Amino acid sequence: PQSNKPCMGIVQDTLCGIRKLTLRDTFIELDQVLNMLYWVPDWDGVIPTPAIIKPKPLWSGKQILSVAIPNGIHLQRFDEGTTLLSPKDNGMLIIDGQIIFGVVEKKTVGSSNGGLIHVVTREKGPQVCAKLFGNIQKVVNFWLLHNGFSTGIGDTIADGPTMREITETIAEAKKKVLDVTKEAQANLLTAKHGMTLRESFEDNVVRFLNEARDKAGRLAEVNLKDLNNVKQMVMAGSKGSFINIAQMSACVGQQSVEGKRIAFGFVDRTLPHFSKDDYSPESKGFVENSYLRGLTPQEFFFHAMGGREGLIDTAVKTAETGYIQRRLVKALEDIMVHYDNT
Amino acid sequence: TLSHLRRTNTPIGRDGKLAKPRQLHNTHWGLVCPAETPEGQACGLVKNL
Amino acid sequence: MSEEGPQVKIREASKDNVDFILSNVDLAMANSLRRVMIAEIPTLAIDSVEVETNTTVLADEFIAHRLGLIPLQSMDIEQLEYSRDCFCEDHCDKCSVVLTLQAFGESESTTNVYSKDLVIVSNLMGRNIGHPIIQDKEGNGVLICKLRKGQELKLTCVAKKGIAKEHAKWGPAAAIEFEYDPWNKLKHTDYWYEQDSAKEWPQSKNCEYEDPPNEGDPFDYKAQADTFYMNVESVGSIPVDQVVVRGIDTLQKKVASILLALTQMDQDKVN
Amino acid sequence: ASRHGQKGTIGITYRREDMPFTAEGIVPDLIINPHAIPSRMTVAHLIECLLSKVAALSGNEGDASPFTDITVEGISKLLREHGYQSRGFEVMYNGHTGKKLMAQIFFGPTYYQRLRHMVDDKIHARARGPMQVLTRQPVEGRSRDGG
Amino acid sequence: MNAPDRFELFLLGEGESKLKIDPDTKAPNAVVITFEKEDHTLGNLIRAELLNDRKVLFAAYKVEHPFFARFKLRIQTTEGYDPKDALKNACNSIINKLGALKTNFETEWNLQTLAA
Amino acid sequence: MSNTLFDDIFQVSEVDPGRYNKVCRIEAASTTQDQCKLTLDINVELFPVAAQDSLTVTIASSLNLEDSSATRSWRPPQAGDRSLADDYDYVMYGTAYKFEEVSKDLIAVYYSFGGLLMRLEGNYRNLNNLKQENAYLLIRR
Amino acid sequence: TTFTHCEIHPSMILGVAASIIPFPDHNQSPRNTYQSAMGKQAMGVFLTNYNVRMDTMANILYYPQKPLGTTRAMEYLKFRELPAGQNAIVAIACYSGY
Amino acid sequence: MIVPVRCFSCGKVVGDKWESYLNLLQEDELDEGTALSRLGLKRYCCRRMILTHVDLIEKFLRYNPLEKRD
C-alpha cells in the first residue's frame, strides 16, 4: 500500500530462464515434456497436442509454460512498433490461459503494474498467485537445469572495428575540448547567461566529455550479438544495464568530487606529476580506459576519491535517516480509522 | 598483525559530521593507502600507511 | 555371440585404466552404469582408530582423518559382513579387520612414517584382503606423518566394509571420462563464437572414429544417442575390470530387488 | 570469500554424482551464480580465473601485479597452446541424466578464504530460563541463554 | 549440529516398505509408485525403459527435494493392461540387457588379456 | 462432408530469417486466385524452403480420414493407423485468434501454432468456412 | 622536460592489506575497499609456533595453499609462507537454482 | 602441514609422490611443469594439489610444544 503495486515477483535466475524458454527458437521433445508436465503439481493428466505433428512431434516452450498459468486469465500489452502479428515478438497476448504471442520478461512476471501477478491476484485471489509462483519456479528451474547458463570474460570483449570507432570518438571529444580551451585562453570566449566565464568553460568541458562517454558506450552495446550472456541478462531485466557494459567495455569516464571535477589540492595543480595551470581533461580526472584494459595510476587515484564519497554517504546518512524515521513514527502513531469513517 | 602495527587515528569525534577530514585528499598520494579504510563511523578517520 | 544385446569394444587396458566404446545402448543405461561405478561398489577402509602415545606435532583427529583415506586391498570383500549385521559385540572376526601402528624417532635426522608400517594382527581366514595398496617405485606408499628425536606414535586401527554413498574413502574409481557425438550431428550443444565457431572450438580425439557431416545433408531429425566413449581409472584397491563387472552386478541386484518387492506385493494383493 | 569482494554462504552440498562434469571427468569443487558479475564489474575475478587456469595447466607462477604489461589476449594465446577454448569455456554434461548441456560453462581455479563466521556460533533458541535480579526480564547473551 | 546420519541413504528404517503403489484418481489406468532410499540412477533407467513399450502412454518421475532419498514414478498404460505388468516387463528387459552387456565385456577383456 | 475446410496452391516470394536460427517467415501469393496471400512462420530445420517454390496448402478440421480429441490427451502414433497426415509432408496444429475485415470483399484470418504466426488474406467466399477455432495446417512440397 | 625526481614504483602507493588483491586496477574501488576489510577474517597460520601459546581463541587451517596468481609485493608480506586460503575449482553457472 | 593424501576433486592419490617430486627439482634440475607431468599428474587439479603446497611441517619440527614466547 505504499505505492499500490506488487512487492514480489520472479527475480534473478528464474527470470533469466523464463525468457530463454519462450523464444520462438525453443522446441521440446517428448520425454522432457512428460517430466515437465509431471513436475507441475496441479496437472490434470492431459497431454497438450503438439504444434508440429509431422514429421516429428515437438512442443514450443510457450506451450509447456502455459500449463502453469491458470485458465481464464487474459492479458494484452502492445510495445513500441508491434502489430496484431508481431514481427519482433514484442508485446504479450494471453487468451484463456494460452500464450498467443510475446516473450515473457521483467515487464510481465516482475513487480510491475498491470503485469501477470497483479491481474492474477486481482481476479483469482492470493492463494492462486501463491501457487503460481511455485508452479513457474519449478517448471523454469527444471528446464534451466538441463539447458545450462554461464558468463565469462568473453562477454566483455568487442571486435576491433568497434574499438576503432570508440577511440575515434574519444579523440574527437578531446579535440573539441582543446579548441574551447584555446578560444577561452585568448579572451574571445563569451560568458553564458547569468554565469561566470570560468563556469562556462567548466560546463562546456564536462558536457563534451559526458557525451563522448555515452556515445562510445552505445556503439559498444550495439556491437554485441544475441548469444552474449551479459546482453541476455540485461535484456531479461535481471542484472545490470548499459552503463555497466559501457564501463567494462568502452570507457570508464569522468571522475568527479562534490559535483565538480578534481579540484586543485596542491597549489595550481592536482598531482605532482603535472605542470602548473593545467586544464586538460586527463589532468582533471578523466578515465579514457576501461575495466578490461586497465587503469593508469592517476585515474586510479581519482576513481578512488569518487568511490570514497559514496562510502561516506552511506556510512553516515544511515544514522541521520534513522533519527528522522523515529521522529516521524512517534509523531503519527495514534491515528486510526473509526466506524464513523472519520 | 601487519595491518594493526601500521595504523593511525585522527582524534576527531567519530560521530562528528565534518565531511572534509573523512574524504581522500590530494596530499595523500604515496603516504596513505587509498583503498583500505574501515566502514561505519570510522570511515576515513582511521588511516593506514 | 549375443547379437541382441549391448556391444563393447575395448581399445586400451592396463592395471589402472580401461578405455573402451559402448554401442547399441541407451543413454540412460550408460549414465546409470557410471553413477553406480562411482558411488555404489563396496571396498575396505579404516573406520576407527585408538591412540596410546602421541608425541608428534600434529593433532589426533588429524592423523585419524589421514588414516581413514589410505587404500587397502579389498578383492574378496564379498565374504565380509556389514558390522551392523554381525552378531558379535563391537567388531567381529568375521566383520572387521585390525591393524597396529608403532613408530619411534630414535635417530637425529627426522624419520618419515609411511603406510608400509601398518601391520595386520587379526586372523584373515585365508582371504585375500587387508593388504595396503602400494604403487610407487620405492614401495613406501602413502606417507602418514613425521618424527623427530624423542617422539613416538602408537595406535590401533579397525577397518570395515561400506560404500561411497556415505564417505568418499570407500570409493574405488578416481575419475571416469564419458563422451559421445563429437561432431554434434544431433545438435545437443550450441557453440559460442566470436567470428567462426568451427575454428575456435578444438577437436576431440574421438573425431577419428566417426565420419564428418557434409554441408549438403539436411539435419537428420530421427537419430538417437547410441555410441559412447568411456575411460575408467581405479584408485588401486580393486582391479578395473572388476570395477566394471561389479557395477553391472550391483545394478542387476538393484533391479532384481525391485522385481522381488513387486512380486511380494502382488502376492499380498492376491490375499 | 574471494579476493574481489565476492563473499557468500554455502546453501547446499552435492555429491560427485549430481555434479555436472566435463568430457575429461573433472568436477567443480564449487559453483557460483553468474548474476553476481555485471553490477559489480569484477572483471579481475574473471582475469584471475583465466590466468590461474593457465598457470595450473602450465606449471609456473603467474604475475598479477598492478600497472604492468600483461593483457587478456596474451594469456588467451598462451591458453590455446594447451588445447582449450580461448575464452575459458568448456563442454559439460548433466549429472543426473548424462545429456549434453545446451550452453557452455566458464570453468577454472580461483582462490578462496574461509571467513570467521560459522553458523554454529550464531544459532540460538530459548523457551524459558534465568531472569534478571532487578528488572526480572530474560537475560542478555547467547552464551547465557538469553532472549 | 543437525547433520543427519549418512546411512539413512541406503538402510530402510523399520516399518518401511521399499515400494508403495497408489492409484491415480485423474487418468484411468494410472498409478503413482513411491520408491524409498533411491535416486535418479534407478528412476531414469526405469522410465527410459518404460518409454519403449508401445502400450505405455505416460511414464514420468521426480525427486521433490534433494535432502531425502526417495522418488516418485507415474505410469499410465492402455486398456486391458496392468501398469505393474509393464514395470515387471521393463525390469526383465533391463536385467537381460545387463546380463548380455556383462558377458560381452568379459569376452572382450579376456580377449585383450590374451592379446596383452 | 469432407473435413478439408480450405485448399489451394501458393508460390513463395522471399524468406525472412531474422534473428532466429530455426524459424523463418515466408510470404506467398496464390497462383489460382489473385486476391489470396499468405504470411507464415515455419520450422525450416525440418522443412527447408527456398524462394520461388510452389506449395500445396490445406486447412482441415480433423485428421481422421473417416467420420473428441480436443479434450482428449494426445496419444503417440501407432503402427497400422492411417490418417490424412500420411499424404502431406508437414502438419501443424493451431488455434485462430483474430478475423479481420480489411475491406468489403477481402478478409484476413490469424492462426497461432504454439507461438508461430500465420496470416491468410483472401476473398469472403474462399475463406467462408474458416470460422473454426482449432485447425490443422497441412503442407505438401 | 625539466624533471627533478622519479617514482620508484606506483604500486607502493598501496598499503599492506591491498597488496594481495590481484589486478586491483580492473576493479571498482569500493570492491578493493571491501576486500581490504575482509582480508583480516581469513583462517590461516597466524604464527608458526601456535602450538605452545594459550590464546583465548585460535583458528588453524589444515592445508594452506599459496595462490596461483601472486602480486610481486607479496614477497615482502610473506603471504607465500603463511597463506590464508585454498585454490578451489569454480564453475560459474546456473545449476538447480541453489 | 604434511601433503594431502588424496586429491580433493578427482579422488586420485598424490600423497606418496611428494618425496619423488622433490627429487626431480634439484637432482635433475628440471622445470615444474615437466616434473609435474613426469609423475602422471595430467588433470590440472592434481597439478594444483602438488604445485601450490606450503610444507609447514619442517618448521614446527624444530620446536617443542612447551615454551613459546611472544
UniProtKB/Swiss-Prot annotation, chain A:
Function of the molecule: DNA-dependent RNA polymerase catalyzes the transcription of DNA into RNA using the four ribonucleoside triphosphates as substrates. Largest and catalytic component of RNA polymerase II which synthesizes mRNA precursors and many functional non-coding RNAs. Forms the polymerase active center together with the second largest subunit. Pol II is the central component of the basal RNA polymerase II transcription machinery. During a transcription cycle, Pol II, general transcription factors and the Mediator complex assemble as the preinitiation complex (PIC) at the promoter.
Organism lineage string: Eukaryota, Fungi, Dikarya, Ascomycota, Saccharomycotina
Protein name as it appears in the record: DNA-directed RNA polymerase II subunit RPB1
Family statement drawn from the similarity comment of this UniProt entry: Belongs to the RNA polymerase beta' chain family.
Transmembrane portions of the chain: none
Residue(s) of cross-link: Glycyl lysine isopeptide (Lys-Gly) (interchain with G-Cter in ubiquitin): K182
Domain comment (free text): The C-terminal domain (CTD) serves as a platform for assembly of factors that regulate transcription initiation, elongation, termination and mRNA processing.
Species assigned in the record: Saccharomyces cerevisiae (strain ATCC 204508 / S288c)
Localization of this protein: Nucleus
Residue ranges, annotated region (Bridging helix): 297-309
UniProtKB/Swiss-Prot annotation, chain C:
Keyword Ubl conjugation: no
Additional observations: Present with 10000 molecules/cell in log phase SD medium.
Keywords tagged on the record: Acetylation, DNA-directed RNA polymerase, Metal-binding, Nucleus, Transcription, Zinc
Reported function: DNA-dependent RNA polymerase catalyzes the transcription of DNA into RNA using the four ribonucleoside triphosphates as substrates. Component of RNA polymerase II which synthesizes mRNA precursors and many functional non-coding RNAs. Pol II is the central component of the basal RNA polymerase II transcription machinery. It is composed of mobile elements that move relative to each other. RPB3 is part of the core element with the central large cleft and the clamp element that moves to open and close the cleft. Seems to be involved in transcription termination.
Compartments, as annotated in UniProt: Nucleus
One record GO biological process: transcription elongation by RNA polymerase II
Subunit field text: Component of the RNA polymerase II (Pol II) complex consisting of 12 subunits.
Principal localisation: nucleus
Cellular-component GO terms for this entry: nucleoplasm; nucleus; RNA polymerase II, core complex
SUPFAM superfamilies listed in its UniProt record: Insert subdomain of RNA polymerase alpha subunit, RBP11-like subunits of RNA polymerase
Highest taxon above the source species: Eukaryota
Binding-site residues for Zn(2+), renumbered to this chain: C86, C88, C92, C95
GO MF entry, a single one: metal ion binding
Presence of keyword Oxidoreductase: no
Sequence positions bearing N-acetylserine: S2
Annotated protein name in UniProt: DNA-directed RNA polymerase II subunit RPB3
Family: Belongs to the archaeal Rpo3/eukaryotic RPB3 RNA polymerase subunit family.
From Swiss-Prot, chain G:
Localisation per UniProt entry: Nucleus
Coiled-coil features, chain-numbered ranges: none
Protein task: DNA-dependent RNA polymerase catalyzes the transcription of DNA into RNA using the four ribonucleoside triphosphates as substrates. Second largest component of RNA polymerases II which synthesizes mRNA precursors and many functional non-coding RNAs. Proposed to contribute to the polymerase catalytic activity and forms the polymerase active center together with the largest subunit. Pol II is the central component of the basal RNA polymerase II transcription machinery.
Other facts noted in the record for this chain: The binding of ribonucleoside triphosphate to the RNA polymerase II transcribing complex probably involves a two-step mechanism. The initial binding seems to occur at the entry (E) site and involves a magnesium ion coordinated by three conserved aspartate residues of the two largest RNA Pol II subunits. Present with 18700 molecules/cell in log phase SD medium.
Complex and partners: Component of the RNA polymerase II (Pol II) complex consisting of 12 subunits.
The family this protein is said to belong to: Belongs to the RNA polymerase beta chain family.
Protein name: DNA-directed RNA polymerase II subunit RPB2
Portion of the full sequence shown: 736 to 833 of 1224
UniProtKB/Swiss-Prot annotation, chain H:
Oligomeric and partner information: Component of the RNA polymerase I (Pol I), RNA polymerase II (Pol II) and RNA polymerase III (Pol III) complexes. Component of the RNA polymerase I (Pol I) complex consisting of 14 subunits: RPA135, RPA190, RPC40, RPA14, RPB5, RPO26, RPA43, RPB8, RPA12, RPB10, RPC19, RPC10, RPA49 and RPA34. The complex is composed of a horseshoe-shaped core containing ten subunits (RPA135, RPA190, RPB5, RPO26, RPB8, RPB10, RPC10, RPA12, RPC19 and RPC40) where RPA135 and RPA190 form the DNA-binding cleft.
Organism: Saccharomyces cerevisiae (strain ATCC 204508 / S288c)
Glycyl lysine isopeptide (Lys-Gly) (interchain with G-Cter in ubiquitin), cross-linked positions: K59
InterPro entries: RNA_pol_su_RPB10, RNA_pol_suN_Zn-BS, RPABC5/Rpb10
Keyword flag Cell wall biogenesis/degradation: no
Subcellular location: Nucleus, Nucleolus
Task of the protein: DNA-dependent RNA polymerases catalyze the transcription of DNA into RNA using the four ribonucleoside triphosphates as substrates. Common component of RNA polymerases I, II and III which synthesize ribosomal RNA precursors, mRNA precursors and many functional non-coding RNAs, and a small RNAs, such as 5S rRNA and tRNAs, respectively. Pol II is the central component of the basal RNA polymerase II transcription machinery. Pols are composed of mobile elements that move relative to each other. In Pol II, RBP10 is part of the core element with the central large cleft.
Name of this chain's protein: DNA-directed RNA polymerases I, II, and III subunit RPABC5
UniProt keyword Cytoplasm present: no
